[PDB]
Structure formats: C-alpha cells, structure tokens
Amino acid sequence: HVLIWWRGKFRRADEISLDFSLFEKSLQGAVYETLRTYSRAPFAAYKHYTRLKRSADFFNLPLSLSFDEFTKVLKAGADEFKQEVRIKVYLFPDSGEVLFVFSPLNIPDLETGVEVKISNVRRIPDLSTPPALKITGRTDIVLARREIVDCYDVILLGLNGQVCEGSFSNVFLVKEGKLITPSLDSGILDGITRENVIKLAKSLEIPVEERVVWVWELFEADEMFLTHTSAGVVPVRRLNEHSFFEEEPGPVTATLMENFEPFVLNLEENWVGI
Amino acid sequence: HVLIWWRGKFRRADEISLDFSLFEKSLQGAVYETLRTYSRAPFAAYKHYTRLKRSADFFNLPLSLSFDEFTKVLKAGADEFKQEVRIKVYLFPDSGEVLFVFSPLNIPDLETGVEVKISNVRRIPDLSTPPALKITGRTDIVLARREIVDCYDVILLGLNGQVCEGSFSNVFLVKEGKLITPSLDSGILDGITRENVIKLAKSLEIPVEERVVWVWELFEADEMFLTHTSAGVVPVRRLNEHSFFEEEPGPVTATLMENFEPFVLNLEENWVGI
Amino acid sequence: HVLIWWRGKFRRADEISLDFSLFEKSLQGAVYETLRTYSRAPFAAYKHYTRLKRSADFFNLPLSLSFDEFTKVLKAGADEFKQEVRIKVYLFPDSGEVLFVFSPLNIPDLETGVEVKISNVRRIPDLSTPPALKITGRTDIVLARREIVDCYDVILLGLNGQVCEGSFSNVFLVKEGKLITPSLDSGILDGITRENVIKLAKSLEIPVEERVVWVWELFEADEMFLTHTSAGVVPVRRLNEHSFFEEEPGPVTATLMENFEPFVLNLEENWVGI
Amino acid sequence: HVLIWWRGKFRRADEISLDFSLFEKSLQGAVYETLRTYSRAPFAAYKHYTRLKRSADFFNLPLSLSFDEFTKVLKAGADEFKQEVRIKVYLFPDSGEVLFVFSPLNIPDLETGVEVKISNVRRIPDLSTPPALKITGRTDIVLARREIVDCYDVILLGLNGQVCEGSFSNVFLVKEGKLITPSLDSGILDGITRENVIKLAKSLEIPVEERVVWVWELFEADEMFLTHTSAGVVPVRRLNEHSFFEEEPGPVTATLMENFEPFVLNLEENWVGI
C-alpha cells in the first residue's frame, strides 16, 4: 500500500511517468529527506524542511515548495493510512520538482538489541563533499548500505579512524555514566533523532559529550546505541564480535528509549506548523 | 532530437514510464560509459565495452548484452542520424538493465583553446570510493560540474594536491618536450582518448611520463590540454588567470591534434567487431 | 668569534664538556629559540621566552631559568660584541639545562630578492606532532633544510597542498593589494616576525587575511616574501621557475620592509623586561 | 657501568668533550640500531649492520667502519662485561662518526605479560618522513615515549587507524590460529626480532599474515604480543582496559616464546662473521 504525490496529484506507486530528460538528470542524484509520523502527524516537519533547503543550497537550486505547502502534502498523505507512515521526500536537480513517497511504517521490536559492524567504506571528507549533503547517489552511503547483510547497520569511520556514523543512523556510546556522541566536526550528518536524544539526555541530567570519538572507544564502551527517524533509539547488543549485553539493554539506553517518544511528542520545536 | 534504446527497443526521448521502484533505485546511480561515431560508425566500441564491464564487475554485475549485441544497438541507433552522434550507455546495479542515449554531436572548433579553473572539490579518497568507478552519482564529479561557470571544465586534485582529472576530461601537460599526464596510481577516471593520445605520442617519438603530477606543475607547464571522447584533444589557453597562449597552441599539442584523427581512425584496435 | 653560556659561566665555543648521559639523551632533540639584537639589545626576549616555555610544556619539563635570568644572560652576552648578534637558546631534556650560543649577525643585502622552491617534505600534521613544537630533531624541518641548495629557503606545504611555511621562515603573499598569510590552523609555527608584520600591515592600513592559502595562489600572486628573526622581511623574486620581479620588490613588500625596523623598535611588547 | 666506543677507542661513559659544532649538529639526530648479546657474543650482527646501512643510505652516508671492524668493536666491548649487554650504535649524518654504547642487559621475567596503551601520537606520514627511517629525533617516537606512564609501551597507529608499531617494539596478534602483524607497506620501523619470529612461526607451520591491521582487530584478538631486541617476545596481558589473560599467555604466544631462543640461536644467518 504505497502512495505518491507527484506533479500536483496523489497517485498509486505502480508506475511513474516523467520527462526523460528529468530521468537522465536524476541519475546524478536527488536531494532528500525521510520523515515518520506519530499519531499520523508528520514529525519534525519544519526541521526536515530546513535540512532539505540546506541540501538544496549546496546547488543554488532553490526549493520549489513552501513550508506551508510541504506540510499540506505531508498531512493529506499521512491521513490516508490507518497506521503510522514512513515518508521520503525527493527534490530533483534543476527542475525543482518534488516527489513524496508514503508507505506504512512497520517498525520492529528492537528491545533485544541489534548487531552492527565496522564498514569498509570511510566517510567522505569535507574537502571532497559536505557531510551534510543528503543526496541519493553519494557513494560512501550507497556503498556502505550494500554491506548490510548480517547486521542492522554498518559504522562508517572517518579517514583518521574517528567514529562518524552509521549508513542511515547516528552513533552514541555510554561510558562511566556519560553519554558520548561524535561532534558535527567529526564530519557527520546532524540527525534530527540525535539532536532530540541530546536534549532528552540533558533533561534527564545525564552528562553529554559531543566530541571526536575514536573507533577503539566503541570496543571499551559500557553501552552503545543508534538513532534514526523510523525507529528512534536502537540499542546495540554486539559490534563486530564484541557483545555489550546478552538480553537487556544497558540502563542509560533503556531510560532514553522509554522516555524518547513522550519527550519528543511534547517538544514544540518538533511540531511547528503542523 | 534524442533517440533512446531501453528494454529491447528504440524509443523517442520525450517521456518515459518506469516501474516506480526501479526509478527510486535508479536515483542511487548508474554505471556509465560514453562513445562517439566517426562516419556514423561507433568508435572504440570494444574498448568502451570492456571498460564498462570493469566498473560493472565492481558491483558483480553481468552485462545483459554481449559485445555483439552491444555493437548492433550502437550501429542501429547511429544509422538513424544524418550526422555524427554522442552515445551515452548506462548500466543499472542489481537489475543489469541497459539504457542507451543517442544525440547529435555538435562539435565546436576549439583550436583557439579553452579556459579551465582549479576546482574547489577534491577527488574522493580511495578509502571512500574507488577512483576509477564511473558511477553517475559520485559527488566529486557532480559538485565539480556545478563550478563550470566561465570556463570549459574544472580540474580536480586529490587530497594531497596531485592532479587527477577534469570533471569530464583527462589532463596532459608538456614541459621541455615531454608529454606528462597523471598516472593511474594518482587515482583517476581513465578515458579511452587518453590512452589513444599516449599511443599517438609514442608513435611520434614524443617522450611520455605517466606519473604523479603536482598542481603547481600545471602553472609552470609550456603547454596544457584536455582529452575527452566527444572532442578528442582540447588545447587549454588559460588556467585560472595564467595564460599559455593567445592565438594557437604550442608545437607538441598542435602536432598531436593534426595527427590524432589520421592515427586513431586507422588503428584496428579501435574498430574490432564493427 | 662565538661565545657560549653553559653551566653558569660564559665560555669559548671551541670545545664543550657535558655529562655523557646528557649527550646521549640530547640526540632525541633539544627545545630551542633564536633571537637577534637591535643596538645590541635582545629583541622580543619575552615573546621568545614564552614560546620556549610552551615548547617545554609539550614535555612537562619545566623551564629552569626565570625570565629575569634569561634576560640577564642575553644582555651580558650581547654586550661582549661591537656588532649585532644572533642568539640560539637550547633547553635540554629531563635535565632542564640551558645553553646560549652568541655569534655575530652577518645579515646580507636582500633588496634584490631571493629564490625559494617548493619542498619535497610536507609539514608534519597535528595528529603526529604539534606544529608549534620547536625541537632540533623534528624531521620535517631537518629534512627540508637539507634541500636548501640553490635557493634561500624551501616552502613546506601541508598534507593537503596548503601553504604552511618555509623551513626557517613564514610566508606572505600580496594579491590585489591585500596581504595574505597562512592561518595558524593551517598547521604552522606562530613566528614572532610574522606577528609583527601583521601588526605593521594594519598600522599602515594594508588589508590582512590570515587564512588557508593553497599552493597555486603563490603562482598567481603579485608579490611574495618571507619573514624570520635574523633578517626581518625578505622579498622573494622567484618561486621555482616563476619570477615575481626582475630588480625591484613589489610596493607592499617595499613599504613593509622599510617600515619594519622603526615599527618593531618602538613597539613595547617586543621590549618588556629589557 | 656504561662503556662507550668513540673516535677510535673505548672510554668510560662519565663525561665527554666534543667539538662544539659537532655537538650542535648532533642535536638534529643520529641514525641508530640496537643489538644485544647471547653468551656475550653480539647477536644478528650482520643483519643489524645492513639495516644501519639502509638508513645511512637515505642520507648518502657511508659507514666509516666495515662489517669486520664493526664486529671487532662489538666483541671487544661485550668482552669487558661479566654479563649480557645491550649495545646502541649511533651514526651521525655528514660526519659519518660512529658511537657505540654498551650497558648491562637487565632482563626481567615478562612471561606474566605487560600492559600497553593506544598512543595519542600518529606515526608521521610518508609525505613528511620515511616511516622506516631510524633517526633519534623523530617526533612520533619521541612524543609517544613520554606517554609510557603506567604501562610497558604504547601503540602508534598511522593516520588512518592502522596499527604500525609500539614506541620501541613491533606488534603481533593471534586470531583463529593465525599470527598477524603489520606489513612493511603499513609504514613501520621493522626490527630484526620481528623477522626472526615470523621465520620461527613458519618453521612451526603457524600461518602468518603480513598485512594492514586495523586498530580494532587488536581489541578482538585472541592473543597479542610485542617484539624487540633486548627482550625477544613479550606477551601483552592487557591493552588499555581490555584483558587478554590474567596468568599465562595463549598457546601460540607460549609456543613461540618457548621455541624462540633454541631457534634463533641455532640459525647461521644470525651469526655470520662472529
């Protein structure tokens, strides 16, 4: 049950009709964002809109849609499901055409923790590409996602062995009661889930450090977890062959994931304009 | 007047209907190769086929068309024009689908030379993406293309300041009668025209060095030129604000240009199977 | 005519008697500073003392000498010459022993400009060694100085091709009337002559930019010059095979070098405690 | 009780008088090699001579002593002790002067294993200094030595996070019965003990891989050990906070240790010319 909004109308996601020149050009990549709903309301819509604009600015391609129109399509689309939706928004090169894809959000039970592995792909450094450019063809993320076989996500290190992030998530570790996450200067995407978790940690009086984190610190951590739009906080039970836990996520991870949804649902900055 | 070949037949390049999920996946990029025709015969076809296979093998992707079938599509499409054509070939990871785009080759007289600039985008390091991978979404090329404002092409350096390539071309310099070009070890996208010019130079007993070339050597060169499929040898009259000439290129470039077409068009290795 | 201060007494520089264990240990390097005199008064004595302390702190080896004692030895030593002196100060590992070497400053006529060349040695990056550690055995500076054969100094680029500095000087360029010099974040030593020249440029209403400077900008510059303790402002007439001028240094360089000595002789921060 | 050989004769290592300018130049560093004796006979003398020549050749420095003269000084000095000795050999660039330092080898029982830590100093890149250059002032080793506080040695990684070496040792890991060690291509100072252990492993049919080793593999290893001249094979019981064992090393390390002395002492290549 997949719905799309394309060229002014909602539509079935069986076939797509587009100008051939747009298709050939889209092979160079589309700028994009992913959203989910809570109670069928689009989450962090304004935050995602401004990130989209920022990705679009790395090309002086202005955004065609207003925030007001963006929210209108998001809400009309989500309203056609009796269930939470995942929403992908693509902005196309030169044309400025926008495509929304709505599909049911089927989020699994991750209380037992996931497996992650160190990627063979290093994150592209700033001198080659801005880390915050969310574009569909960027080869670090394209090549790294193809490595996800017997794990949930792969961890991209930067060129010097600093922890950057997962192929579709941000990384946090816990050590001696402190919540530690790579700084934006490590060369990472400023995830919206990450941002919310940092604020939640502070509201719970958990100490937080945003800094350069070296790969070997993950192997000495008391806890590790991932953050991304669809799932929120995702506990990591094993990195490569290194287990953090057997059954229960660690205590800092557990408090953050139980408090995540109530905290973000009542933080106004995640609901502006909706 | 664009013609395409897609899913078993030739079509007008006006609009295209695609399986929607194919379209979505195509946004991650296609493996690509470009050819042109001389006398409406596709040039260096076998060489271009084997190079395409090389990038396809990186993704464990078999070519759905044999060399023989490949040449049949190329000849068939080129025969529909009353003029020389540019042909772009796209190969899609996992699906193995092939897309050909034929268009009129409009080739200007560039004897007078072009302007080029040093790009602000460094070639993606080998730890992040193979330098020789011809995938349409690679962000070094994509972002470097957007800097082409008052110039012909821009020059991408590697992280260390060595010369790699232009955004659509290979780079050659001449210093004290030697033809010098970045080695494959410099981490480059190597085009067939580059190899052809190297062989031409050797046949004329012009010394050739394929080595690491530092950016500042471009600024001290006696002559500089670009190579690419559609235009062959393109003299550079100016790099940033640094002039090489005002009217006509130097002796080594001029000799290479005047001998290029006679030499490459009479070499059997460029016509195998056509 | 070379004088030394060693183990509490002034001495002839023919022989030196030291504990063998100190000699073996000194093969690992001594922290050091170089000074010159104006009117036989030690220049920027306090500035050099604090840099020495900072180099010493990269080892938690505290400085044995007080500033007051430092100035006392500097002045007593300089007072024994009827001529300006060059002064080298070495601080030795673990022991904290200090050695001063006084020799006549024989400064040549550099009004005609000097030749410099790009070094084959890249400046050691911060992850390997702090750029501000002035130690006698650091291999970037040791290896680069051995390259000075038919030039005055060699220019060390950083790992990415940014201009860092000369083997014993800092680098400035002039472009469209702006004075431009590598920022400290480029990974360089904060030279005391450099600092004074930046202040002098500002006092003369010359615009100054401290930023990342890429190697190719030197080849497009209107003017280039070096700064170091012994000589002050040193005009560069040629970089590699690229001439900036034939006879006369450019106008910005010329104003700075004529105004340098009067400016620094009347700036109190260069004379504190003397 | 230190004995030295300097300028044609053996001397007490109490005080030393030097030509002052020699001393000043010695502060830039010496090429070095270390040996020990078994039964008061200098071990792997020819191997150590040829390695010294290799670093000396980098500076176009001929060895002032022939192999035969070298062995005479080594035997003569070792014969003055009633005990095994450590011998350090220093060679000075340009002058070609040689300094030998003989001292009692006091060798502890390290069967129980040592503690090591990951250093905060990255191995100097190849663009700045050759990785295999054994010069006493190299700042990666000098600064890494100062971190040895509550541990035996620290581990230097390269800029990319690969394992290179300890500050005075080579690094080996064991994983699934394979002995793994950084390749020469990783950019390392290769010691003679490393080569001897590799040959020992092969003679015992233990599989050996010389390859690029990433830091995190140390944290997942079954066993880890160091090699260096004075101690041979040194088991690592703990890396940072990560324990490998509490009482005795694993089977591969234990076998290598128990077979080391019998094997290396009965190999003619380690005794040529003695």
Ligand SMILES: Cc1ncc(COP(=O)(O)O)c(C=O)c1O
């Ligand atoms: C590389 C990368 N890192 C992190 C994220 C997570 O960011 P957010 O929390 O906004 O979903 C994403 C988005 O999925 C991403 O693609």
Ligand SMILES: Cc1ncc(COP(=O)(O)O)c(C=O)c1O
């Ligand atoms: C590498 C390096 N850069 C720059 C300088 C110049 O600094 P200052 O102006 O304090 O002499 C020096 C000192 O000679 C140096 O060794």
Ligand SMILES: [Cl-]
């Ligand atoms: Cl142009």
Ligand SMILES: [Cl-]
């Ligand atoms: Cl750049």
Ligand SMILES: [Cl-]
């Ligand atoms: Cl220990």
Ligand SMILES: [Cl-]
């Ligand atoms: Cl580090």
